[PDB]
Amino acid sequence: AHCDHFLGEAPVYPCKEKACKSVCKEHYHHACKGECEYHGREVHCHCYGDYH
């Protein structure tokens, strides 16, 4: 169980760090952390969790 893995992405705009972490658990139930990062031009909510 490491939160060092990306599980996927969550569509969160505007992307708040805490909201991202929250929406990530909605999409990916085994997600623990979510963080907003800019990729390209838009901000993506990256869902961290343990991939199993």
Swiss-Prot record:
The chain holds residues 29 to 80 of 80 of the full protein. Disulfide bonds join C15-C36, C20-C45, C24-C47. The keyword Disulfide bond applies. GO terms for biological process: defense response to fungus; killing of cells of another organism. It is found in: Secreted. Belongs to the DEFL family. The keyword Phosphoprotein does not apply. GO terms for cellular component: extracellular region; secretory vesicle. This is Defensin-like protein 204. Keywords: Antimicrobial, Disulfide bond, Fungicide, Plant defense, Secreted, Signal.
